[PDB]
Amino acid sequence: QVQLQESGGGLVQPGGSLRLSCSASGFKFNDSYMSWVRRVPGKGLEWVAGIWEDSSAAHYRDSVKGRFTISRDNAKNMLYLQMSSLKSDDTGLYYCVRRGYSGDYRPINNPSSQGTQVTVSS
Amino acid sequence: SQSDFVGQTVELGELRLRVRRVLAEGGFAFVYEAQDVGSGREYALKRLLSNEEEKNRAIIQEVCFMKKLSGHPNIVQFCSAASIGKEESDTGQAEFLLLTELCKGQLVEFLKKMESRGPLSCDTVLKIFYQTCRAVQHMHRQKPPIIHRDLKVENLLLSNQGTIKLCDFGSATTISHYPDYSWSAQRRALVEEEITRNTTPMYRTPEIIDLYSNFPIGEKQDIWALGCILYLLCFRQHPFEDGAKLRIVNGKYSIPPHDTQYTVFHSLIRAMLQVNPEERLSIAEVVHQLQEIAAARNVNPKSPITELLEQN
Numbered sequence A: 001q002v003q004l005q006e007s008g009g010g011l012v013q014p015g016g017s018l019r020l021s022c023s024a025s026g027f028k029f030n031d032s033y034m035s036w037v038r039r040v041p042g043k044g045l046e047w048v049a050g051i052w053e054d055s056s057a058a059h060y061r062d063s064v065k066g067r068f069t070i071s072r073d074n075a076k077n078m079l080y081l082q083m084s085s086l087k088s089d090d091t092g093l094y095y096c097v098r099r100g101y102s103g104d105y106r107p108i109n110n111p112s113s114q115g116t117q118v119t120v121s122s
Numbered sequence B: 001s002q003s004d005f006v007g008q009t010v011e012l013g014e015l016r017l018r019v020r021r022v023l024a025e026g027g028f029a030f031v032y033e034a035q036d037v038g039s040g041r042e043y044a045l046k047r048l049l050s051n052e053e054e055k056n057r058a059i060i061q062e063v064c065f066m067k068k069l070s071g072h073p074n075i076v077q078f079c080s081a082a083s084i085g086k087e088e089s090d091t092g093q094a095e096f097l098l099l100t101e102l103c104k105g106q107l108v109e110f111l112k113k114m115e116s117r118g119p120l121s122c123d124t125v126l127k128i129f130y131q132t133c134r135a136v137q138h139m140h141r142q143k144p145p146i147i148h149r150d151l152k153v154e155n156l157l158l159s160n161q162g163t164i165k166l167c168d169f170g171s172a173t174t175i176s177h178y179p180d181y182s183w184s185a186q187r188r189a190l191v192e193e194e195i196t197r198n199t200t201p202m203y204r205t206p207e208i209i210d211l212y213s214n215f216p217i218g219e220k221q222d223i224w225a226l227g228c229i230l231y232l233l234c235f236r237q238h239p240f241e242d243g244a245k246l247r248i249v250n251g252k253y254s255i256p257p258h259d260t261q262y263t264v265f266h267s268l269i270r271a272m273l274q275v276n277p278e279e280r281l282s283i284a285e286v287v288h289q290l291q292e293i294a295a296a297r298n299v300n301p302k303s304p305i306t307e308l309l310e311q312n
C-alpha cells in the first residue's frame, strides 16, 4: 500500500524560491529510488529530479540543473525538493513517485497522491 | 540464480545498470527492471540463459528485427545487447542480454484494475486497436516483411507516454510458406510443428492447423490474430477460447447478438477472421477503415489513452 503526501507549494513570482516536502509510507523507503515529477497544463506529466537509495547519486533534467536540489531523509521517510530562480515553465502540479524515468523524461510510476501546486507569475 | 540477478550491476556500453526487480519469468529468460546509476534512466532487461544454439540463434534474429523496427512510436525501443560465453557466466550457461526501454507495464493488468469503472468506451478500444495495427503495418512495410506470429494482448504494452507498444519478437520471422501438392505429407507435418511452437494455441490460424488446403503461411497470420484481439477488447473474451481445431479451421465463432456498444467494429471483426488468408483484409485496409471510424467519432486515435495512464 504505497502512500505519499506532498506539501510546501504555493504562489511565488519569477526568481523566487520554494521547498517541497513529501512523507512516504507503505513501502521500504530505504531501498527505493525516489523522484520528483510535475504536471504542467498543456504538456502533461514530466520527470523533474531523482535520487538514489543512499543519496550517492542525484539526477536532474536539463531545465533545472543547478537550480533545483533534491534530497531525502530515510530516518523520517521524507523527500525534499529545494527550488530557486523559478521560471514560468516551473509552474505545475508537483508529485513525488517511486523509481525513475524512460525516454524523454517520462516518469515510470504515475502519481497516486494529491500533489502540491506551484504557480509562478506576477 | 536468475533470482540472484536482482541487486547486481551490469555494464552495457557507457551504461552501468542496477537490477531493480523481476518483471517477467520465463523458462528460458527473465525480464528485469534496470536503472542507470549515472542518468537515472530506466530500462527493461531480458536475460537469456541456455546452451541450446536453437534458442541462442533465435534471440540474435530477435535483436536484428528490433533494431530495424526502431524509431516507431508504437514499438518498444531497442537500446543495447551483449553476448556472454558459458565460461564468464556463473550459471554455466551461455548468457544473452536484451535491453529495451521501460514502459508502464502490460496492457492486460491495467485493464483488470479498471474494470471497476465499468465497460470500455468504443473510443478507448479504437485507440488501442489502431495503435496496435499501426505497429503491425510498420512491420509489414519492412524489406523483407516481418511477421509477428505471436500477436496477443499479453504482448501489448502501455508506454509511459500513454500509447500502445509491441514488445516480444521471439516468434517473429520473415519466412513465408507456400504449400502446394508437390509437398509431401511429412514436410507438411514438419513445417507445422515448427510454427506451432511459436504460436499461442487459441491464436493459431487456420492455415497452420490445416496444411492440406494449400493456404499460404505469410503475413496474413497477423491479420487473423488482430481479429481475435478486437473481439477480445469488445467482448472481453476470446472468440476461440477452447482452442478447438474444428472451430478454428471451419472458422466457427459467435458475435454477441444483443451488442449495442461495439456495433461499429462488427464489420472489421468478420472481415479479419476469414478462414482463407487470401480473403482477409490487408493491414492497410484495416488501418484505413479505422481512420474513418475515428473521424466519424471526433477522436484522435494516435492520442494517449489517459484513462489507462492514470490507472495505478
Ligand SMILES: COc1cc2ncnc(Nc3ccc(F)c(Cl)c3)c2cc1OCCCN1CCOCC1
Pocket (backbone or CB within 6 Å): B023, B024, B031, B044, B045, B046, B076, B098, B099, B100, B101, B102, B103, B104, B105, B106, B109, B157, B167, B168, B169
Ligand atoms: C514496469 O512494467 C513493465 C515494463 C516493461 N517495459 C518493457 N518491456 C517489458 N516486457 C518485455 C517483453 C518482452 C521482451 F522481449 C522484453 Cl526484452 C521485455 C515490460 C514489462 C513490465 O512488467 C510486466 C509484468 C507486470 N508485473 C506483474 C507482476 O507484478 C509486477 C508487475
